[PDB]
């Protein structure tokens, strides 16, 4: 009689992904010397790249960061179609004005987040760089505007705002003020007026494939044992053994006559291993009658 089935359980799990080498300089806007104005904000186009968010978050080398809709540790296994980086310089009291669905001085009239925005906000203290003796008037901001800007809209144009109705042309009259003003940055002021560099990460998801994602962690390789293996294309369980099979340079894995995968090539290094599923079978019980003996 067959009373059960036995199977060898895997000892551990092995996950190996191809090399992330030849990374793109995604930290250029993070290490940049000088940004543009809050209305002049530049959008960095990142395509066909891999960005490492572990040194950007887990290292805790920056002042603060805030996430929306997704945890910072979930960004390694998740990603969308496109990723953008918006670099601009603001004040301390204007940091809270950057958030989805919130209104403010720079929120409506300069840079606005959509309600469905899934990205993150990154900030750090720039007072040791962006501040200088006598004040830095290079950066400007739009205080007044007649309407509200659409989300992710850039308007660098200059004009003269009119509060009331007056024929102000090239002069400052009654109810006519300059929409653009300069920051009052000085190193002697407290943390509220200290300049902070806020670079918001904008994520875009479309029908196009995702060419920009997080880092890929890999593990050590173990041979001649039953393990759970995932190399970049598939999941499976078996015993890994080096064999004499020869793969063409573009071939990742391979299958047998049953259309089941019998071999896979390491996406990281170059090695060819056959895939043999772990041993199993039925449990057969050899026993005499109950009235004979218990053996």
């Amino acid at each position: 009689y067959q009373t059960s089935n036995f199977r060898v359980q895997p000892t551990e799990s092995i996950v190996r992904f191809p090399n992330i080498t030849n990374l793109c300089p995604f930290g250029e806007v993070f290490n940049a010397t000088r940004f543009a104005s809050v209305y002049a904000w530049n959008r960095k186009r990142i395509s066909n790249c891999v960005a490492d968010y572990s040194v950007l978050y887990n290292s805790a080398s920056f002042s603060t960061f805030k996430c929306y809709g997704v945890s910072p540790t979930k960004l390694n296994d998740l990603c969308f179609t496109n990723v953008y980086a918006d670099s601009f310089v603001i004040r301390g009291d204007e940091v809270r004005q950057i958030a989805p669905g919130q209104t403010g001085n720079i929120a409506d009239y300069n840079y606005k987040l959509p309600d469905d925005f899934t990205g993150c906000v990154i900030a750090w203290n720039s007072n040791n760089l962006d501040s200088k003796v006598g004040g830095n008037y290079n950066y400007l901001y739009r205080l007044f505007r007649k309407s509200n800007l659409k989300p992710f809209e850039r308007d660098i144009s200059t004009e003269i705002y009119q509060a009331g109705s007056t024929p102000c042309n090239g002069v400052k009259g009654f109810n006519c003020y300059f929409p653009l003003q300069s920051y009052g940055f000085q190193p002697t002021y407290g943390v509220g007026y200290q300049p902070y560099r806020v670079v918001v990460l904008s994520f875009e998801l479309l029908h196009a494939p995702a060419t920009v994602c997080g880092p890929k962690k890999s593990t050590n390789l173990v041979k001649n044992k039953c393990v759970n293996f995932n190399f970049n294309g598939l999941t499976g369980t078996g015993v890994l053994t080096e064999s004499n099979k020869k793969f063409l340079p573009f071939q990742q894995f391979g299958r047998d006559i049953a259309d089941t995968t019998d071999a896979v090539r390491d996406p990281q290094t170059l090695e060819i291993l056959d895939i043999t599923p772990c041993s199993f079978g039925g449990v057969s019980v050899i026993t005499p009658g109950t009235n004979t003996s218990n053996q």
Binding site: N230, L234, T235, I257, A258, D259, T260
Partner: protein
């Protein structure tokens, strides 16, 4: 021997059929959809196999 070969071969080839699901491999299905939305497609695949 050929009819038995065709029967064993058929039984292995049915694992590759999609059976109306997203994919015939269950790990990408469990790793993407939430469990309540996921259970309808896994029940369609178990019943098909």
């Amino acid at each position: 021997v050929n009819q038995n070969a065709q029967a064993l071969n058929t039984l292995v080839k049915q694992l590759s059929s999609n059976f109306g699901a997203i994919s015939s491999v269950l790990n990408d299905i469990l790793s993407r959809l939430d469990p309540p939305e996921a259970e309808v497609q896994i029940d369609r695949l178990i019943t098909g196999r």
